[PDB]
Design an enzyme around this catalytic site. Structure first.
Site, short mmCIF file in Angstrom:
data_model
loop_
_atom_site.label_atom_id
_atom_site.label_comp_id
_atom_site.label_asym_id
_atom_site.label_seq_id
_atom_site.Cartn_x
_atom_site.Cartn_y
_atom_site.Cartn_z
N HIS A 151 2.14 10.88 -1.99
CA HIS A 151 0.91 10.61 -1.27
C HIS A 151 0.05 11.87 -1.22
O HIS A 151 0.53 12.96 -0.92
CB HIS A 151 1.21 10.12 0.15
CG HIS A 151 0.01 9.64 0.89
ND1 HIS A 151 -0.04 9.54 2.26
CD2 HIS A 151 -1.20 9.22 0.45
CE1 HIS A 151 -1.22 9.09 2.64
NE2 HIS A 151 -1.95 8.88 1.55
N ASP A 177 0.48 5.81 -6.94
CA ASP A 177 -0.44 6.95 -6.84
C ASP A 177 0.08 8.09 -7.71
O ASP A 177 0.48 9.16 -7.23
CB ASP A 177 -0.60 7.37 -5.39
CG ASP A 177 -1.47 6.42 -4.60
OD1 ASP A 177 -1.80 5.34 -5.13
OD2 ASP A 177 -1.82 6.74 -3.44
N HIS A 218 0.85 -1.19 0.00
CA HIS A 218 0.00 0.00 0.00
C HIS A 218 0.88 1.24 0.00
O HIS A 218 1.56 1.52 0.99
CB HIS A 218 -0.93 0.00 1.21
CG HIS A 218 -1.62 1.31 1.45
ND1 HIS A 218 -1.13 2.26 2.32
CD2 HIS A 218 -2.76 1.82 0.93
CE1 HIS A 218 -1.95 3.30 2.32
NE2 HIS A 218 -2.94 3.06 1.49
N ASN A 219 0.85 1.99 -1.10
CA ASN A 219 1.68 3.17 -1.29
C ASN A 219 3.15 2.85 -1.03
O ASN A 219 3.79 3.38 -0.12
CB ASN A 219 1.19 4.32 -0.40
CG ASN A 219 -0.26 4.69 -0.67
OD1 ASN A 219 -1.12 3.81 -0.76
ND2 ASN A 219 -0.53 5.98 -0.81
N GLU A 256 -3.58 4.39 -8.78
CA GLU A 256 -4.58 5.35 -8.32
C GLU A 256 -4.32 6.66 -9.04
O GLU A 256 -3.60 7.52 -8.53
CB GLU A 256 -4.53 5.52 -6.80
CG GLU A 256 -5.89 5.51 -6.13
CD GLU A 256 -5.79 5.40 -4.62
OE1 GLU A 256 -4.86 4.72 -4.13
OE2 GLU A 256 -6.64 5.99 -3.92
N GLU A 299 1.79 -0.31 -5.71
CA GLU A 299 0.79 0.72 -5.93
C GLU A 299 1.46 2.01 -6.37
O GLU A 299 2.44 2.44 -5.76
CB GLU A 299 -0.03 0.95 -4.66
CG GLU A 299 -0.74 2.29 -4.58
CD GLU A 299 -1.72 2.35 -3.42
OE1 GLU A 299 -2.44 3.36 -3.29
OE2 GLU A 299 -1.76 1.39 -2.63
#
Length: 1061
Positions: A363, A350, A318-319, A397, A348
């Site tokens: 982030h 973003d 996650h991130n 994302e 991931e």
């Protein structure tokens, strides 16, 4: 390559070469000669041959790469060096890999460096335990003196013994051991040190070997377990392997002979029957060879990779670009590289808006730095399949504009080529392919086109505290009309001057005691005040085995003072005399002698304001109650006792601690030694005593007046955990204040020496303002308006990228319903929503899982990068459980345990039983049944690391990580101040763990130590899937917080798995 070429290359490496070294700390790269040391197995880069400057453990080299693709090579000074010449080593036991970047003068030289490095690394990971034991001993010896000598003294041995986390019992048994090894005259050759070391642990923990004796059954060892060295024979050793260890390959005798020959690694031991010494046997029981981990699961089991992708637990994060907390951490491609090489198969991205037009990753709405997307995708392409050829899945994302994802997809295609997946592998298939069918391919997960073809302020602000009287940078966010901010983001005065020391007798006693405890030298000195001679100093100087005394003479000259000795060497600043006398000896009519040692007064803390000469306990608590800040401390000499004490407010409670005196040293608790109190406070300002708190704030009466002036500090006040969950800063929120009660007014010129500040002006006028300050005036005005409203074809997705996604398509149209699972969909769940789903419809979630893919990521309230519990999701078959890889929590160590299997490929096939329609993921109490009992008895450890100054007092917790029914714990009696060779109670019995789901259950051995305040702290972990746990007496290799192995760390445990019949 031939062996002679390997030897030549390794010899050329051993000689070393002047190679330019690059680092972020220096703009100009530095020419330091780099050489490998086989004795310590360390790549040391230094200037002079006598002393080595840089240290680099060879076995901690995680990956070596050529070229300039590293963080160091961004100074724009490495342009001159050719690309092939430059290279970089990544090493360490942390998620951020400390990088050592070198630039060879010769490209051929760089090639030999790389090749020999690789060979050395392979040998190191293949090196047997005695060889690395010898290497670590040479490490300690090189540590004690930088001249790489092969000799260590009794005093130096006493200095090193607590560094290796073992205490000296009486300092006389140590001399007895000296005598026994045969070393004499306080000298130790390396072989003598090695033999003493072996004798030390063997005497400490021979009681373990006894249990390997136990009774009846087969007597592997006889009664020859005394200190006297004894051998284990080939037939006996193979009997032990066959019976106690139950090893199949142990059936053949040639395999056992090879195992002994590799383990001992001695040229002399060429006899027909290799023999294991009893000390060598105890070492073997603690080695990597006897690891409880089963080697068969490191091999990639191909037939388990024939199944469709929907049946595999998938490694995900996650991130991942974030190397720390979710707010302000540095984002580096090395995070992605270390995750992919770690065994992950989902990262991931973003991707956000690009300044020049090229997307970046950071982030959302935080201060995390940005990295150019092209570099990132180059890193993925270069290090996706180096460690594992199985496919990766890039979860995206997106947040950028149409042209930006158009360029993003274009870059994807250009950099990936045939590696990327652009078409379905099986057009007519109704299910997901197999990882084997998808080997060396890259899937892109991202929101595609629609069904019909159509689709808070956070900043690092300054805090002004009246008590502090300085500005402290605090990261702050606004939510629900409140503001939450984290903790902080960041002669007379010399040693040799002693002033009022009572007498020449007193000063000479001081120097004599200091000398006889350590550091006795020739002509060593001490500056004091003469009790007889008026207004003159006195350099009293020990004389080559004895103590003498002479007054620093003085005469007035040229309007100034002129101190001197013999009237020949005269100066005005005491440093001039002391240094010039040190480098060149004073020549008095009797001797030519120099000086060594400055000793602080017996009570130097007297000069420190934070010391209180004699304050009663009640008054100490009184002032401590008057000061609300956490981190306040004051030291006080306890009345009627020579011992001292220190008081500190932690968690709102005032706590007293007692410091004892051992010689000139101050001991804290029972194991930490500090020369002086000022050293203690200076160390503990940069380290932790209680929990995470550090001694930051001294307590002085002059500061105490200002403390009394202002005593109101806003703070966090499982209810506190609920408040933590509510606020956007999570557990990082150190202060929270309601912004409605504060009618903000923007400060025109600021205050307290800052360019841009604004005033809170609370509604109740008596309440003290806080006055946050910003870096940018525009940022100031944006924040100010923020509190002001606190007072009062394609639409979004690029066509080409939507063409790129062929699998793992994101759908929320069916929403919370999982009905009609089709293989192409992706489900993205937040941990709270995922847990709600698993509590409501556990069976249905698996029913979707066998057909469709499920991805779960932690909630935004976990800004501390903490990882949630993933066991329940996996037990339901949640294939993609994403956790933060930069953190170290029990759950992520659980993930590492589970996903080390299958050759850390990232794909772990779920068992057939879980995939049957009849089976239910969460079983009720009646449907649960025991299916294997496990008996574990811990026996001892080795080389438990050292966290701080205090010597660890370790105890071992063995527990089954698992569901609520599998969770069972075991604690062992704590061993007092014995970390290197701890022997847990042989009388303590074995625990019995009932296991319901052996297909997914974890055996977790963790080592903690009891601090001075009796609060456990984390030392090392070892997490293992229960399918990979072997029987017998096996040694688990302990790992640090990030699942990296710690050298020589090992726990011996007797483990027996009896399946239920």
């Amino acid at each position: 390559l031939a062996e002679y070429e390997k030897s030549q290359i390794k010899r050329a490496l051993e000689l070393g070469t002047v190679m330019t070294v690059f680092s972020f700390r220096k703009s100009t790269p530095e020419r330091r000669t780099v050489q490998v040391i086989m004795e310590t197995r360390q790549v040391a880069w230094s200037k002079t041959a006598d002393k080595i400057e840089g240290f680099l453990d060879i076995m901690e080299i995680k990956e070596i790469r050529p070229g300039k693709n590293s963080k160091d090579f961004e100074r724009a000074k490495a342009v001159r060096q050719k690309e092939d010449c430059c290279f970089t080593i990544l090493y360490g036991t942390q998620f951020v890999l400390s990088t050592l970047s070198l630039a060879a003068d010769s490209k051929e030289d760089a090639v030999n460096w790389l090749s020999g490095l690789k060979i050395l690394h392979q040998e190191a990971m293949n090196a047997s335990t005695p060889t690395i034991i010898e290497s670590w001993l040479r490490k300690q010896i090189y540590s004690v003196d930088q001249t790489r000598r092969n000799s260590i003294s009794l005093r130096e041995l006493k200095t090193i013994l607590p560094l290796i986390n073992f205490k000296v019992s009486s300092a006389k048994f140590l001399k007895d051991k000296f005598v026994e090894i045969g070393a004499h005259k306080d000298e130790l050759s390396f072989e003598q040190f090695h033999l003493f070391y072996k004798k030390l642990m063997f005497e400490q923990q021979k009681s373990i070997l006894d249990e390997f004796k136990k009774d009846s059954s087969v007597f592997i060892l006889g009664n020859t377990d005394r200190p006297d060295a004894s051998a284990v024979y080939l037939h006996d050793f193979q009997r032990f392997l066959i019976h106690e260890q139950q090893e199949h390959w142990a059936q053949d005798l040639n395999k056992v002979r090879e195992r002994m020959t590799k383990f001992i690694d001695d040229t002399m031991r060429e006899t027909a029957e290799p023999f294991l010494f009893v000390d060598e046997f105890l070492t073997y029981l603690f080695s990597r060879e006897n690891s409880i981990w089963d080697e068969k699961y490191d091999a990639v089991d191909m037939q388990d990779m024939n199944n469709p992708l929907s049946h595999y637990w998938i490694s995900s994060s996650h991130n991942t670009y974030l190397t720390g907390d979710q707010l302000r951490s540095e984002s580096s491609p090395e995070a992605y590289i270390r995750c992919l090489r770690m065994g992950c198969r989902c990262i991931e991205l973003d991707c956000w808006d690009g300044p020049d037009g090229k997307p970046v990753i950071y982030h959302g709405w935080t201060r995390t730095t940005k990295i150019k997307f092209d570099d990132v995708v180059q890193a993925i392409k270069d290090h996706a399949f180096v460690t594992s050829s199985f496919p990766v899945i890039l979860s995206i994302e997106e947040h950028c504009s149409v042209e930006q994802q158009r360029h993003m997809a274009k870059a994807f295609k250009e950099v990936f080529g045939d590696l990327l997946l652009t078409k379905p592998t099986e057009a007519s298939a109704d299910q997901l392919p197999s990882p084997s069918q998808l080997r060396e391919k890259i899937i892109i997960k991202h929101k595609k086109l629609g069904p019909r073809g159509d689709v808070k302020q956070q900043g690092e602000l300054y805090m002004w505290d009246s008590i502090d009287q300085k500005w402290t940078r605090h990261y702050c966010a606004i939510a629900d009309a409140k503001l939450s901010f984290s903790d902080d983001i960041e002669h007379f005065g010399e040693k040799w001057f002693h002033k009022k020391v009572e007498k020449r007798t007193s000063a000479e006693k001081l120097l004599q005691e200091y000398c006889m405890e350590t550091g006795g030298k020739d002509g060593t000195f001490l500056v004091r005040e003469s009790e007889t001679f008026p207004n003159d100093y006195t350099l009293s100087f020990w004389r080559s085995g004895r103590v003498q005394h002479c007054r620093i003479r003085s005469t007035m000259e040229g309007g100034t003072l002129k101190y001197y000795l013999t009237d020949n060497l005269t100066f005005s600043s005491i440093y001039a005399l002391i240094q010039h006398y040190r480098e060149t000896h004073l020549r008095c009519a009797e001797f030519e002698l120099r000086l060594t040692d400055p000793v602080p007064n017996p009570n130097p803390h007297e000069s420190k304001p934070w010391y209180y000469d004699s304050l009663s306990r009640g008054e100490a608590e009184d002032m401590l109650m008057r000061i609300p800040r956490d981190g306040a401390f004051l030291i006080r000499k306890r009345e009627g006792s020579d011992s001292y004490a220190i008081t500190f407010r932690a968690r709102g409670k005032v706590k007293h601690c007692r410091i004892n005196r051992d010689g000139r040293h101050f001991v804290l608790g029972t194991s930490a030694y500090f020369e002086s109190l000022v050293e203690l406070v200076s160390y503990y300002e940069k380290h932790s005593l209680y929990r995470k708190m550090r001694l930051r704030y001294p307590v002085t009466p002059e500061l105490l007046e200002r403390y009394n002036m202002e005593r109101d500090i806003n703070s966090l006040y499982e209810l506190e955990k609920q408040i933590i969950e509510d606020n956007p800063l999570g557990s990082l929120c150190r202060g929270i204040l309601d912004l409605n009660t504060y009618n903000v007014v923007k400060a025109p010129q600021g205050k307290n020496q800052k360019s841009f500040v604004f005033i809170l002006e609370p509604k109740q006028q008596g309440d003290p303002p806080v006055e946050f300050a910003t870096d940018r005036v525009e940022e100031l005005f944006e924040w100010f308006q923020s509190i002001r409203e606190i007072t009062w074809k394609n639409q979004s997705i690029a066509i080409e990228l939507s063409d790129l996604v062929v699998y793992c398509k994101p759908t929320s149209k069916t929403k919370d319903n999982l009905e009609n699972p089709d293989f192409r969909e992706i489900r993205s769940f937040v941990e709270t929503k995922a847990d709600s789903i698993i509590r409501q419809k556990p069976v249905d979630l698996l029913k979707y899982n066998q057909k469709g893919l499920t991805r779960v990521y932690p909630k935004g309230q976990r800004v501390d990068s903490s990882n949630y519990d993933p066991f329940r999701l996996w037990l339901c078959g949640s294939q993609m459980v994403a956790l933060n890889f930069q953190t170290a929590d029990k759950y992520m160590q659980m993930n590492h345990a589970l996903f080390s299997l299958n050759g850390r490929t990232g794909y772990v096939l779920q068992p057939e039983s879980m995939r049957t329609e009849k089976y239910d993921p969460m079983p009720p109490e009646s449907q649960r049944k025991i299916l294997m009992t496990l008996t574990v008895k811990v026996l001892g450890a080795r080389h438990l690391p050292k966290l701080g100054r205090s010597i660890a007092c370790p105890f071992v917790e063995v527990e089954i990580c698992g569901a609520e029914y599998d969770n069972n714990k075991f604690k062992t009696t704590v061993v007092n101040d014995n970390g290197l060779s701890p022997i847990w109670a042989p009388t303590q019995e074995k625990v019995t763990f009932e296991i319901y789901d052996p297909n997914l259950a974890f055996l977790r051995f963790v080592v903690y130590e009891e601090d001075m305040f009796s609060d456990p702290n984390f030392l090392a972990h070892a997490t293992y899937p229960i399918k990979a746990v072997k029987s017998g007496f096996r040694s688990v290799p302990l790992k640090n917080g990030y699942s990296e192995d710690i050298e020589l760390a090992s726990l011996l445990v007797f483990c027996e798995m009896r399946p239920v019949l």
